């Protein structure tokens, strides 16, 4: 036979496809590796991510430009005061065929979907976003759908909404993967952005590098890379460090945390290091595969207190200690 060798062909065939996939996304968009692997590791997990800023014409560019080159659809929701949890799910129309107004599927049927100002929308919207995001399915008034596959929400905040504003509390944001706060880009970035973009012949249409089902099959790739009963335990202590810090010797820890990360983290974390391991091309987890995404995991789990808050203590600076503190089993 030769099934071992076809896996280990199709591990090393699906490893290069990501290169080709960064260097085809690469072709419009720059300075911005951080942002294209965090959404990468985000589809090929199933995981959702929250932007604290309105991402801007690079950055939405480069989410545009990364569902072209793996063949998935990508839709913008603009999030206002006046919409409504049916407007997420649900678009009437009028079917010419049919001859009568009848509710399409919606615009979160999408792979990945851009949920900008989710801020702007009453709570009620939000809740509608969230429950997609945690049933994959919903309800078009009798018959029941299921959302794409693979299925992003990269759902945006702007942090100094100076009109209406009602920001998603901690028991919601829990349910994205990553919190990831966006920053300008460097002077250089910005120049070589202009410069192609400004240019009105700018040739935008990329390849696809790789198909919807190649996608799928990248996701088990992930899913098949191992990790030592070591680094699950750490996994493990690193999210009970947060929920009984002085219990580790972080005494002053505990007098800044109200409390800490949920089962969430810990099954993020796992995920998300094996994403790392395979995107550094490797089939089993190390130490700083998980190390490099615990802030990202971890920044909006640790909810802190009210005198913590004000004093100007970070959550930062909380995982930097923990993961100073907390050590590996051999």
Excluded at 12 to 29: A, S, T
Excluded at 267 to 284: E, W
């Amino acid at each position: 036979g030769m099934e071992l060798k076809s896996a280990e062909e199709k591990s090393l065939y699906y490893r290069n496809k990501i290169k080709e996939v960064i260097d085809e996304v690469g072709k419009v968009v720059v300075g911005q590796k951080y942002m294209i692997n965090r959404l990468l590791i985000g589809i090929c997990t199933g995981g959702h991510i929250l932007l604290e800023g309105v991402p801007g014409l690079a950055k939405t560019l480069s989410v545009n430009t990364l569902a072209k080159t793996m063949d998935l659809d990508f839709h913008r929701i603009q999030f206002t005061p006046d919409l409504l949890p049916s407007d997420l799910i649900g678009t009437m129309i009028y079917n010419q065929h049919k001859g009568n107004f009848e509710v399409k599927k919606g615009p979160v049927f999408s792979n990945f979907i851009l949920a900008d100002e989710v801020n702007r929308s009453p709570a009620k919207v939000q809740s509608a976003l969230l429950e997609c995001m945690q049933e994959k399915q919903v309800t078009i008034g009798d018959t029941t759908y299921p959302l794409d596959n693979p299925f992003l929400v990269l759902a945006t905040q702007n942090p100094v909404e100076q009109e209406g504003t009602y920001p998603l509390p901690e028991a919601q944001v829990d349910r994205f993967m990553m919190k990831i706060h966006l920053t300008y880009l460097d002077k250089e970035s910005e120049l070589e952005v202009m410069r192609r973009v400004s240019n009105m012949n700018f040739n935008y249409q990329v390849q696809k590098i790789v198909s919807k089902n190649d996608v799928l099959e990248i996701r088990n790739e992930i899913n098949k890379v191992t990790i030592s009963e070591s680094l699950e335990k750490y996994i493990i202590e690193l999210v009970f460090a947060t929920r009984f810090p002085a219990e580790y010797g972080l005494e002053a820890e505990a007098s800044y945390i109200l409390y800490g990360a949920s089962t969430r983290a810990a099954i993020n974390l796992n995920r998300v290091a094996k994403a790392m391991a395979f995107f550094n091309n490797r089939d089993y987890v190390l130490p700083e595969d998980i190390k490099e995404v615990a802030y990202d995991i971890l920044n909006h789990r640790i909810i802190l207190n009210y005198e913590a808050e004000a004093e100007g203590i970070s959550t930062r600076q909380i995982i930097e200690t923990i993961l100073r503190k907390v050590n590996i089993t051999k």
